[PDB]
Amino acid sequence: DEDETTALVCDNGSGLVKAGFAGDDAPRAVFPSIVGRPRHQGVMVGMGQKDSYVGDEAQSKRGILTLKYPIEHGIITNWDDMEKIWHHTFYNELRVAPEEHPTLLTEAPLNPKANREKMTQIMFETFNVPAMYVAIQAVLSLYASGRTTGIVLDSGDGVTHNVPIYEGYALPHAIMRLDLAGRDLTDYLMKILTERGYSFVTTAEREIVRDIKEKLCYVALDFENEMATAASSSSLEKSYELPDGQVITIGNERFRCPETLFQPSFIGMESAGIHETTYNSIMKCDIDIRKDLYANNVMSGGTTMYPGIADRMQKEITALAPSTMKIKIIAPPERKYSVWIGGSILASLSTFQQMWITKQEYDEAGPSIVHR
Amino acid sequence: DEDETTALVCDNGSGLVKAGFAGDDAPRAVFPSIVGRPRHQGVMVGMGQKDSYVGDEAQSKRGILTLKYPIEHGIITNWDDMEKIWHHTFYNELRVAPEEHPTLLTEAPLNPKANREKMTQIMFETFNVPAMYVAIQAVLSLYASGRTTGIVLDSGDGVTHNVPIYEGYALPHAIMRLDLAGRDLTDYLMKILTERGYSFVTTAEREIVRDIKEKLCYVALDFENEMATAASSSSLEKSYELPDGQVITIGNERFRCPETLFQPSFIGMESAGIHETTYNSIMKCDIDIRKDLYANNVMSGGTTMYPGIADRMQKEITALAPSTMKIKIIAPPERKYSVWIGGSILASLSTFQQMWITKQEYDEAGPSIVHR
Amino acid sequence: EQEEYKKEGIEWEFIDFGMDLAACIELIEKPMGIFSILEEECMFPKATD
Numbered sequence A, B: 001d002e003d004e005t006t007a008l009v010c011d012n013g014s015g016l017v018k019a020g021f022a023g024d025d026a027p028r029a030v031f032p033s034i035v036g037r038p039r040h041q042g043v044m045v046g047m048g049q050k051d052s053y054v055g056d057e058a059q060s061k062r063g064i065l066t067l068k069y070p071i072e073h074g075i076i077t078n079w080d081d082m083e084k085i086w087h088h089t090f091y092n093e094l095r096v097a098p099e100e101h102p103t104l105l106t107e108a109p110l111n112p113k114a115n116r117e118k119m120t121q122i123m124f125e126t127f128n129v130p131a132m133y134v135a136i137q138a139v140l141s142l143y144a145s146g147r148t149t150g151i152v153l154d155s156g157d158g159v160t161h162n163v164p165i166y167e168g169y170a171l172p173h174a175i176m177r178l179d180l181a182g183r184d185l186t187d188y189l190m191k192i193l194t195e196r197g198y199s200f201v202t203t204a205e206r207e208i209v210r211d212i213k214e215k216l217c218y219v220a221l222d223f224e225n226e227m228a229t230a231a232s233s234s235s236l237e238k239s240y241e242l243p244d245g246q247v248i249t250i251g252n253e254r255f256r257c258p259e260t261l262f263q264p265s266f267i268g269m270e271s272a273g274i275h276e277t278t279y280n281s282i283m284k285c286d287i288d289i290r291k292d293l294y295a296n297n298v299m300s301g302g303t304t305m306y307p308g309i310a311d312r313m314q315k316e317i318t319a320l321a322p323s324t325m326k327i328k329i330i331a332p333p334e335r336k337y338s339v340w341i342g343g344s345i346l347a348s349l350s351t352f353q354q355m356w357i358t359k360q361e362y363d364e365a366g367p368s369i370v371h372r
Numbered sequence C: 001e002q003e004e005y006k007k008e009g010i011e012w013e014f015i016d017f018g019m020d021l022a023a024c025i026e027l028i029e030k031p032m033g034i035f036s037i038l039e040e041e042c043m044f045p046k047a048t049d
Helices: A056-060 A079-093 A113-127 A137-144 A182-194 A203-216 A224-232 A274-282 A290-294 A309-318 A335-348 A359-365 B056-060 B079-093 B113-127 B137-144 B182-194 B203-216 B224-232 B274-282 B290-294 B309-318 B335-348 B359-365 C004-008 C019-029 C034-041
Strands: A008-012 A016-021 A029-032 A035-038 A065-068 A103-107 A131-136 A150-155 A160-166 A176-178 A238-241 A247-250 A297-300 B008-012 B016-021 B029-032 B035-038 B065-068 B103-107 B131-136 B150-155 B160-166 B176-178 B238-241 B247-250 B297-300
Touching: A008 A079, A008 A335, A016 A079, A016 A335, A029 A056, A029 A079, A035 A056, A035 A079, A056 A065, A079 A113, A103 A113, A103 A137, A103 A335, A113 A131, A113 A359, A131 A137, A131 A335, A137 A150, A137 A160, A137 A297, A137 A335, A150 A274, A150 A290, A160 A274, A176 A274, A182 A203, A203 A238, A203 A247, A274 A290, A274 A309, A297 A309, A297 A335, B008 B079, B008 B335, B016 B079, B016 B335, B029 B056, B029 B079, B035 B056, B035 B079, B056 B065, B079 B113, B103 B113, B103 B137, B103 B335, B113 B131, B113 B359, B131 B137, B131 B335, B137 B150, B137 B160, B137 B297, B137 B335, B150 B274, B150 B290, B160 B274, B176 B274, B182 B203, B203 B238, B203 B247, B274 B290, B274 B309, B297 B309, B297 B335, C019 C034
Parallel strands: A008 A103, A103 A131, A150 A297, B008 B103, B103 B131, B150 B297
Antiparallel strands: A008 A016, A016 A029, A035 A065, A150 A160, A160 A176, A238 A247, B008 B016, B016 B029, B035 B065, B150 B160, B160 B176, B238 B247
C-alpha cells in the first residue's frame, strides 16, 4: 500500500495535463497546460496579489493575464513555467505532498535525452519525490490496449505521431511526427464556420467553436460522396444552440474539419496525412515485423476521437497495404486517456516496483540513471 | 544403463548443432551454431546483463548483437565460442551434467589432427566428461544406412564432401570438398527471387527466403526441358503466403536454385559440380573397389533433401560411369540427421564400449590417445 | 544465544543466523524479484505465462 495507493501518474500534454493515482480508471485531474501572468497590478475581491495563475484559473481570467504554453508540440520548452504546472498538480489539484509519493511521468516520442535528465533533476531535487519513472507516451497507450507490438497513431492538442513499438521498444528510426492536431483543427473549423456566414466575435463565441468540433464533428468515410450528399441536402445538417438562443447551423463543415487530418492541403500544409504517414512508418520498419504493425494500429489521443476515424483509416491503409496483409485499426472508447490509463496499470503493477528510479539511485548515479 | 542411457551424441555443424541421447531416433536438440555478443549495454525486462547469447536467442535478438559462427566450413575456427556452444548444449538444451555422461562427438572429413586433440583437451579438461569419442561424419552417415563400404555425398550448411569409405576406413586421398552448400543456396535464391521483381527488405522477409528454399525447391531431372516447360507455362508455378498476406509467386526459380549444385557457374564458381565430383572421387580410388562405391552412393545432409536430387544424380553418374557398372543412389528420408542417427546407433551399441576414450586413457596418454 | 555467552562471560562471536536466508527472501520480495515480475506483467494486457 506504501506505494500501491501512493503512485502518481502525470501525463503532461500540449493542451491538457491528465493526473491522478495509479490504480484509478481515469485521471483525477484534467486541466489546461497554461500559466498566466497578470498584465496589470490589482486584486480579486478577498484575495491577495497573485503572481501567477495555472490551468483553469488562467483560462477563466485570460483577459488580464499573458497566457503561456510550457509544452510546445509535446516537448517542454519552458522549465520555469513547467515546474509551476507540476506544483499546481501536486499541491492543489491532487492535494498530495509529493515527498512521499512515487511519480510516473510521461514524455514524448523523440524527447531529447537532456530533457528526460532535466525533469528528473526537478522531480528529485526541487519536489523531493521518493522515486519516479518516465514512460514514452505511445508506449503506454499500446500497453493499455493489452499489447506490446503494434504502431500507435497518437494525436492530441499540438502533435501527431506514429510510434511503431516491438516487444516494448519504440523504434526510433520509424517514428513520424506531424505538427497538426486538435488545436490546428479548432482554428480551421472556426474559419469554415465564419465562412458559412458567421461571427465568433466575443471570447464566449471563440471558446465554444471547440465544443462544436468535439460534439458535432465527424470523419466520414467516402468524404467524396459526402460533399455530394451535402448538396442534395439531406437531413445531414446539425444546429447547435450557442451560450444564448443564437442557434447556429452546421451541416456540411461538420466533416470538412477532420478531412483536414487526411488532407493537410486544406490548411496550407504540404506534409503527408495521417494514413499515409501510418503507412510510411511501416515501410521504414523491418520487413518481418510489418505484418504485426498492420494488424495493430492502436489509436490514442483527443483528436482521434472524431467518430468514423477508424473506418476511414481502415480503408485508407487496406488500400495502400499489399492484399496479402491483415489490416486492424484498434480505437478504444477511453482513448482520450489511453496514455494515462497505460501508466496507471503499469505503475500499479506488481512487477514495476523494480524499475522505479529511487533517490538512492539518483543521489548516487546523477540524472543519467533514469535517462537509460 | 550406467551409460546405455547416458551416452550423448553431439553433431557440430556449420549451421546447426544436432544433439540428444544415444538410443533416441532423432536429435533432442537442434539449434543454430551462433554466439551473439551484444553491441550495446542494457537489459531485457526481468533479466540481468548477459555477456553472450547462443543458438536461437542469438538469432532472435540479432539486431543488438554481433553474431559469430564458430565452425567455418565444418572445421572449428574459434575455440572460445565453440566451448560456449557446447556449454549451452549440455546445460541448457539437454539439461544434463556432462561429468557423468559419455559424449560421442563428430568431426569433419580431413579435420586437422590438432583439432581432434584440442576438442578432446576441452571435453576432458574443461567439461570433465567420463569418456568421449570423435566419429567422422560421412562415416556415421554410411553406417546409419546399414553399410560399411560406399561413398557418401555429404552436404549441409557450409560444406559439401565426398567421402569414399571401405570397410569402415574413410579414404583420405579420395575425399573431395566443395565449399558451396545450403547457405550459398539460400542467398542465390534470394537474388533470383528479387530478380523475379521482389523485395526482401526487412529481416522478416530475409529469413523466410530460406523457408521458401526448403518447402518449394526442387531438383529437376532434365533441367533443360524444364526451363522449356516453364515458358509454355504450365501449372508448374507455386505461390507462398508471406508472414502477412503478400502472396509471393515462384514458378520457375524453384529449381534454378538446386541446378546450382550441378552447375556452380550459376554462382560464379569455377569448381566442378556434385555429380562430377562423386565420380572424380571414384576414379581416384582403387580399381577393384570402384564397383562397390558405385552401387552405394549414400546421401546425407540438409541440402541433399531437395526432391528429385537422387534421380538427377542417378542419371548424372550412370551417364559418366562405364556401362558395365551398377549405379545406386541411396537417399533415405531421415537424411538431414543421418550423421546423428549413425552416432546414436553406434554409441548405444553393445560393442562400442571398448572404443570409448576414458579419463583413465587420457590422464595417462595425453590428447594423442583419442587422436588415433 | 548471545545473551548467555554474555551472561556467562564466554567468548563466542557469531553472525546472525537469519542472514543465511536473506538471499532467498530478497529474490522473492525485492523489486526486481519474482513477485514484481509477476505483478508487473499482470499489467500487460497481452502477456502470457
